């Protein structure tokens, strides 16, 4: 449970995140893609990128990231009561897209590693460590969510 100073230092660096969402998502998932390329595989809207710098050229990619981004705002807003915003998001996941949890770990990873790039003065140790634990609250809803469907490994 993340405390309410915890929840201010996320939101703070959070409203910095949205003034520019977009290229805030095109950093995040490039830098998934690239750390991680099985993360590529399981996009096949994406899959023929083979290049970072076509990467940042596609603007489905850019559209996609704000996709990604607004719902993970709508979620961190929620300060942990979320557990209408998970629900779909979970069952398509785990369902359709199949991606595995720690491939959420992973663009967590991306997401700190973005905001501290971009956010070095509202993105403190304090705030890097809120930001871990708002994430690893995410991680684990989802997680227990895919383990009811039988997804969890
Ligand atoms: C912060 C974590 C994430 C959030 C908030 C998020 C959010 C979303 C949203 C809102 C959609 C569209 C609606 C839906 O299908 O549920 C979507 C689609 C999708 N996501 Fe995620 N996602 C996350 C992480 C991931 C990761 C790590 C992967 C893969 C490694 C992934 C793979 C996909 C795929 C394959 C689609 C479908 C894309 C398409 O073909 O249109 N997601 N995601």
Known sequence: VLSEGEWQLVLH??????ADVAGHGQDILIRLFKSHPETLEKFDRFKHLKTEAEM?????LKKHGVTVLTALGAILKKKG???AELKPLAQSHATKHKIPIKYLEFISEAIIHVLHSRHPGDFGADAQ???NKALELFRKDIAA???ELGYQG
């Open 13 to 18: 660096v959070w409203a910095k995140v949205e």
């Open 145 to 147: 969510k895919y383990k």
């Open 56 to 60: 940042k050229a596609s603007e489905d």
């Open 129 to 131: 460590g809120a930001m």
């Open 81 to 83: 009561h979320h557990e």
